[PDB]
């Protein structure tokens, strides 16, 4: 009667990891969950996705999970659990890949997924007001501020581009 099962299972997953991180420390958990730092480790495939589960502070997590719950829960409500899973897998895969090239393999966070969900929801809403999915200009304003804020350290754009591409492809139905 609220947010769907994919919205919830992600939130719990990131909660479990964040706690493990508190009890064991960041390093120990990064060591097993981070994008491979060494080609020998390229067959531990969980790492191409599991970087997205790790958060480094209670604000880090809370801020991502608020967006995830609002955006992801809207995608799962209007479009189903299948669509969220796939936006989530592809975006984590790709924003992890771009991020790793920008700055190496020691990173974590669901914000690549979150920027895919923002691009997606906003474009789908723009091109396809039908499916009940839309992003307020207030929130699109918060997206771009968040991006330029990131450029001044006050993944993102890669995420953004995946969500915009997927939403385009999904809105070729006029």
PDB file of C-alpha atoms in Angstrom:
ATOM      1  CA  UNK A   1       0.000   0.000   0.000  1.00  0.00           C
ATOM      2  CA  UNK A   2       3.161   2.236  -0.132  1.00  0.00           C
ATOM      3  CA  UNK A   3       6.490   1.799  -2.008  1.00  0.00           C
ATOM      4  CA  UNK A   4       7.173  -1.420  -3.839  1.00  0.00           C
ATOM      5  CA  UNK A   5       9.406  -4.360  -3.081  1.00  0.00           C
ATOM      6  CA  UNK A   6      12.392  -3.204  -5.229  1.00  0.00           C
ATOM      7  CA  UNK A   7      12.361   0.252  -3.621  1.00  0.00           C
ATOM      8  CA  UNK A   8      12.433  -1.559  -0.180  1.00  0.00           C
ATOM      9  CA  UNK A   9      14.972  -4.320  -0.840  1.00  0.00           C
ATOM     10  CA  UNK A  10      17.524  -1.791  -2.115  1.00  0.00           C
ATOM     11  CA  UNK A  11      17.019   0.447   0.991  1.00  0.00           C
ATOM     12  CA  UNK A  12      17.509  -2.549   3.285  1.00  0.00           C
ATOM     13  CA  UNK A  13      20.531  -3.712   1.297  1.00  0.00           C
ATOM     14  CA  UNK A  14      22.227  -0.296   1.658  1.00  0.00           C
ATOM     15  CA  UNK A  15      21.266  -0.236   5.320  1.00  0.00           C
ATOM     16  CA  UNK A  16      22.863  -3.629   5.957  1.00  0.00           C
ATOM     17  CA  UNK A  17      26.092  -2.631   4.195  1.00  0.00           C
ATOM     18  CA  UNK A  18      26.271   0.775   5.937  1.00  0.00           C
ATOM     19  CA  UNK A  19      26.008  -1.050   9.278  1.00  0.00           C
ATOM     20  CA  UNK A  20      28.639  -3.647   8.353  1.00  0.00           C
ATOM     21  CA  UNK A  21      30.785  -0.663   7.477  1.00  0.00           C
ATOM     22  CA  UNK A  22      30.225   0.842  10.951  1.00  0.00           C
ATOM     23  CA  UNK A  23      31.129  -2.379  12.764  1.00  0.00           C
ATOM     24  CA  UNK A  24      34.064  -3.410  10.498  1.00  0.00           C
ATOM     25  CA  UNK A  25      35.175  -0.031   9.074  1.00  0.00           C
ATOM     26  CA  UNK A  26      35.023   1.281   5.480  1.00  0.00           C
ATOM     27  CA  UNK A  27      38.276  -0.312   4.371  1.00  0.00           C
ATOM     28  CA  UNK A  28      37.398  -3.906   5.144  1.00  0.00           C
ATOM     29  CA  UNK A  29      34.038  -3.543   3.393  1.00  0.00           C
ATOM     30  CA  UNK A  30      35.435  -1.592   0.425  1.00  0.00           C
ATOM     31  CA  UNK A  31      38.026  -4.340   0.041  1.00  0.00           C
ATOM     32  CA  UNK A  32      35.318  -6.864  -0.872  1.00  0.00           C
ATOM     33  CA  UNK A  33      32.606  -4.573  -2.449  1.00  0.00           C
ATOM     34  CA  UNK A  34      34.611  -1.966  -4.448  1.00  0.00           C
ATOM     35  CA  UNK A  35      34.958  -2.024  -8.212  1.00  0.00           C
ATOM     36  CA  UNK A  36      38.010  -4.403  -8.964  1.00  0.00           C
ATOM     37  CA  UNK A  37      41.285  -2.480  -8.371  1.00  0.00           C
ATOM     38  CA  UNK A  38      43.279  -5.277  -9.946  1.00  0.00           C
ATOM     39  CA  UNK A  39      42.528  -7.181 -13.252  1.00  0.00           C
ATOM     40  CA  UNK A  40      43.055 -10.501 -11.443  1.00  0.00           C
ATOM     41  CA  UNK A  41      39.824  -9.562  -9.552  1.00  0.00           C
ATOM     42  CA  UNK A  42      37.741  -8.890 -12.707  1.00  0.00           C
ATOM     43  CA  UNK A  43      35.915 -12.187 -12.321  1.00  0.00           C
ATOM     44  CA  UNK A  44      34.357 -11.186  -8.975  1.00  0.00           C
ATOM     45  CA  UNK A  45      31.334  -9.700 -10.867  1.00  0.00           C
ATOM     46  CA  UNK A  46      29.402  -8.695  -7.744  1.00  0.00           C
ATOM     47  CA  UNK A  47      31.810  -5.669  -7.553  1.00  0.00           C
ATOM     48  CA  UNK A  48      30.462  -4.031 -10.725  1.00  0.00           C
ATOM     49  CA  UNK A  49      27.247  -3.460  -8.798  1.00  0.00           C
ATOM     50  CA  UNK A  50      28.091  -3.625  -5.090  1.00  0.00           C
ATOM     51  CA  UNK A  51      30.038  -0.286  -5.024  1.00  0.00           C
ATOM     52  CA  UNK A  52      26.522   1.286  -5.211  1.00  0.00           C
ATOM     53  CA  UNK A  53      25.584  -0.164  -1.809  1.00  0.00           C
ATOM     54  CA  UNK A  54      28.350   1.427   0.152  1.00  0.00           C
ATOM     55  CA  UNK A  55      27.933   4.749   1.930  1.00  0.00           C
ATOM     56  CA  UNK A  56      30.438   6.689   3.930  1.00  0.00           C
ATOM     57  CA  UNK A  57      28.237   8.712   6.237  1.00  0.00           C
ATOM     58  CA  UNK A  58      24.704   8.874   7.602  1.00  0.00           C
ATOM     59  CA  UNK A  59      24.002  11.961   5.410  1.00  0.00           C
ATOM     60  CA  UNK A  60      25.481  10.230   2.340  1.00  0.00           C
ATOM     61  CA  UNK A  61      23.092   7.364   2.782  1.00  0.00           C
ATOM     62  CA  UNK A  62      20.079   9.355   3.937  1.00  0.00           C
ATOM     63  CA  UNK A  63      20.251  11.755   1.033  1.00  0.00           C
ATOM     64  CA  UNK A  64      20.613   8.985  -1.598  1.00  0.00           C
ATOM     65  CA  UNK A  65      17.854   6.874   0.009  1.00  0.00           C
ATOM     66  CA  UNK A  66      15.399   9.766   0.097  1.00  0.00           C
ATOM     67  CA  UNK A  67      15.866  10.270  -3.658  1.00  0.00           C
ATOM     68  CA  UNK A  68      15.915   6.530  -4.352  1.00  0.00           C
ATOM     69  CA  UNK A  69      12.653   6.085  -2.314  1.00  0.00           C
ATOM     70  CA  UNK A  70      10.909   9.008  -4.042  1.00  0.00           C
ATOM     71  CA  UNK A  71      12.190   8.426  -7.614  1.00  0.00           C
ATOM     72  CA  UNK A  72      12.539   4.605  -7.464  1.00  0.00           C
ATOM     73  CA  UNK A  73       9.188   4.188  -5.752  1.00  0.00           C
ATOM     74  CA  UNK A  74       7.548   6.332  -8.476  1.00  0.00           C
ATOM     75  CA  UNK A  75       9.190   4.223 -11.251  1.00  0.00           C
ATOM     76  CA  UNK A  76       8.176   0.974  -9.496  1.00  0.00           C
ATOM     77  CA  UNK A  77       4.556   2.305  -8.892  1.00  0.00           C
ATOM     78  CA  UNK A  78       3.837   3.570 -12.467  1.00  0.00           C
ATOM     79  CA  UNK A  79       6.109   1.165 -14.409  1.00  0.00           C
ATOM     80  CA  UNK A  80       6.729  -1.905 -12.247  1.00  0.00           C
ATOM     81  CA  UNK A  81       9.533  -3.693 -10.506  1.00  0.00           C
ATOM     82  CA  UNK A  82      11.111  -4.917 -13.774  1.00  0.00           C
ATOM     83  CA  UNK A  83      11.846  -1.399 -15.010  1.00  0.00           C
ATOM     84  CA  UNK A  84      13.496  -0.199 -11.697  1.00  0.00           C
ATOM     85  CA  UNK A  85      15.736  -3.328 -11.511  1.00  0.00           C
ATOM     86  CA  UNK A  86      17.025  -2.694 -15.024  1.00  0.00           C
ATOM     87  CA  UNK A  87      17.514   1.086 -14.652  1.00  0.00           C
ATOM     88  CA  UNK A  88      19.359   0.172 -11.407  1.00  0.00           C
ATOM     89  CA  UNK A  89      21.623  -2.614 -12.827  1.00  0.00           C
ATOM     90  CA  UNK A  90      22.572  -0.756 -15.996  1.00  0.00           C
ATOM     91  CA  UNK A  91      23.172   2.565 -14.216  1.00  0.00           C
ATOM     92  CA  UNK A  92      25.254   1.052 -11.416  1.00  0.00           C
ATOM     93  CA  UNK A  93      27.260  -0.904 -13.968  1.00  0.00           C
ATOM     94  CA  UNK A  94      27.910   2.194 -16.135  1.00  0.00           C
ATOM     95  CA  UNK A  95      28.358   4.966 -13.597  1.00  0.00           C
ATOM     96  CA  UNK A  96      30.723   2.615 -11.785  1.00  0.00           C
ATOM     97  CA  UNK A  97      32.642   2.172 -15.063  1.00  0.00           C
ATOM     98  CA  UNK A  98      32.932   5.885 -15.854  1.00  0.00           C
ATOM     99  CA  UNK A  99      33.722   6.744 -12.213  1.00  0.00           C
ATOM    100  CA  UNK A 100      36.462   4.175 -12.040  1.00  0.00           C
ATOM    101  CA  UNK A 101      38.158   5.890 -15.100  1.00  0.00           C
ATOM    102  CA  UNK A 102      37.770   9.339 -13.667  1.00  0.00           C
ATOM    103  CA  UNK A 103      39.186   8.628 -10.287  1.00  0.00           C
ATOM    104  CA  UNK A 104      40.039   4.965  -9.674  1.00  0.00           C
ATOM    105  CA  UNK A 105      38.324   2.152  -7.980  1.00  0.00           C
ATOM    106  CA  UNK A 106      37.855   3.488  -4.414  1.00  0.00           C
ATOM    107  CA  UNK A 107      34.331   4.943  -4.479  1.00  0.00           C
ATOM    108  CA  UNK A 108      30.782   3.942  -3.421  1.00  0.00           C
ATOM    109  CA  UNK A 109      27.241   5.239  -3.361  1.00  0.00           C
ATOM    110  CA  UNK A 110      23.897   5.017  -4.980  1.00  0.00           C
ATOM    111  CA  UNK A 111      24.088   8.501  -6.607  1.00  0.00           C
ATOM    112  CA  UNK A 112      24.820   7.170 -10.111  1.00  0.00           C
ATOM    113  CA  UNK A 113      21.587   5.194  -9.853  1.00  0.00           C
ATOM    114  CA  UNK A 114      19.825   8.274  -8.449  1.00  0.00           C
ATOM    115  CA  UNK A 115      20.965  10.484 -11.344  1.00  0.00           C
ATOM    116  CA  UNK A 116      19.732   7.803 -13.784  1.00  0.00           C
ATOM    117  CA  UNK A 117      16.409   7.806 -12.005  1.00  0.00           C
ATOM    118  CA  UNK A 118      16.215  11.671 -12.196  1.00  0.00           C
ATOM    119  CA  UNK A 119      17.077  11.815 -15.926  1.00  0.00           C
ATOM    120  CA  UNK A 120      14.590   8.978 -16.584  1.00  0.00           C
ATOM    121  CA  UNK A 121      11.619  10.290 -14.549  1.00  0.00           C
ATOM    122  CA  UNK A 122      12.117  13.857 -15.981  1.00  0.00           C
ATOM    123  CA  UNK A 123      12.477  12.744 -19.652  1.00  0.00           C
ATOM    124  CA  UNK A 124       9.690  10.142 -19.470  1.00  0.00           C
ATOM    125  CA  UNK A 125       7.549  12.903 -17.925  1.00  0.00           C
ATOM    126  CA  UNK A 126       8.589  15.386 -20.631  1.00  0.00           C
ATOM    127  CA  UNK A 127       8.016  13.102 -23.664  1.00  0.00           C
ATOM    128  CA  UNK A 128       5.344  10.860 -22.333  1.00  0.00           C
ATOM    129  CA  UNK A 129       3.102  12.592 -19.748  1.00  0.00           C
ATOM    130  CA  UNK A 130       0.867   9.469 -20.147  1.00  0.00           C
ATOM    131  CA  UNK A 131       2.609   7.011 -17.791  1.00  0.00           C
ATOM    132  CA  UNK A 132       2.042   9.304 -14.726  1.00  0.00           C
ATOM    133  CA  UNK A 133       5.759   9.745 -14.183  1.00  0.00           C
ATOM    134  CA  UNK A 134       7.143  13.271 -13.883  1.00  0.00           C
ATOM    135  CA  UNK A 135       9.831  15.391 -12.225  1.00  0.00           C
ATOM    136  CA  UNK A 136       9.041  18.863 -10.885  1.00  0.00           C
ATOM    137  CA  UNK A 137      11.235  21.656 -12.219  1.00  0.00           C
ATOM    138  CA  UNK A 138      12.061  22.309  -8.516  1.00  0.00           C
ATOM    139  CA  UNK A 139      13.722  18.898  -8.464  1.00  0.00           C
ATOM    140  CA  UNK A 140      15.316  19.339 -11.950  1.00  0.00           C
ATOM    141  CA  UNK A 141      16.741  22.588 -10.507  1.00  0.00           C
ATOM    142  CA  UNK A 142      18.094  20.510  -7.636  1.00  0.00           C
ATOM    143  CA  UNK A 143      19.611  17.974 -10.058  1.00  0.00           C
ATOM    144  CA  UNK A 144      21.725  20.591 -12.003  1.00  0.00           C
ATOM    145  CA  UNK A 145      22.776  22.416  -8.791  1.00  0.00           C
ATOM    146  CA  UNK A 146      23.897  19.080  -7.427  1.00  0.00           C
ATOM    147  CA  UNK A 147      25.911  18.456 -10.627  1.00  0.00           C
ATOM    148  CA  UNK A 148      27.712  21.875 -10.697  1.00  0.00           C
ATOM    149  CA  UNK A 149      28.127  21.560  -6.867  1.00  0.00           C
ATOM    150  CA  UNK A 150      29.886  18.208  -7.668  1.00  0.00           C
ATOM    151  CA  UNK A 151      32.236  19.986 -10.134  1.00  0.00           C
ATOM    152  CA  UNK A 152      33.443  22.179  -7.175  1.00  0.00           C
ATOM    153  CA  UNK A 153      33.339  19.369  -4.558  1.00  0.00           C
ATOM    154  CA  UNK A 154      31.164  21.791  -2.523  1.00  0.00           C
ATOM    155  CA  UNK A 155      29.235   9.107 -11.978  1.00  0.00           C
ATOM    156  CA  UNK A 156      26.594  11.852 -12.114  1.00  0.00           C
ATOM    157  CA  UNK A 157      26.492  12.826 -15.730  1.00  0.00           C
ATOM    158  CA  UNK A 158      27.071   9.132 -16.731  1.00  0.00           C
ATOM    159  CA  UNK A 159      24.045   8.220 -14.588  1.00  0.00           C
ATOM    160  CA  UNK A 160      22.131  11.144 -15.922  1.00  0.00           C
ATOM    161  CA  UNK A 161      22.876  10.090 -19.549  1.00  0.00           C
ATOM    162  CA  UNK A 162      21.798   6.428 -18.961  1.00  0.00           C
ATOM    163  CA  UNK A 163      18.444   7.525 -17.499  1.00  0.00           C
ATOM    164  CA  UNK A 164      17.878  10.057 -20.312  1.00  0.00           C
ATOM    165  CA  UNK A 165      18.789   7.462 -22.996  1.00  0.00           C
ATOM    166  CA  UNK A 166      16.509   4.755 -21.460  1.00  0.00           C
ATOM    167  CA  UNK A 167      13.631   7.224 -21.111  1.00  0.00           C
ATOM    168  CA  UNK A 168      14.095   8.284 -24.739  1.00  0.00           C
ATOM    169  CA  UNK A 169      14.057   4.729 -25.979  1.00  0.00           C
ATOM    170  CA  UNK A 170      10.952   4.041 -23.775  1.00  0.00           C
ATOM    171  CA  UNK A 171       9.208   7.155 -25.228  1.00  0.00           C
ATOM    172  CA  UNK A 172       9.618   6.378 -28.955  1.00  0.00           C
ATOM    173  CA  UNK A 173       5.921   5.360 -28.621  1.00  0.00           C
ATOM    174  CA  UNK A 174       5.042   9.114 -29.316  1.00  0.00           C
TER     175      UNK A 174
END
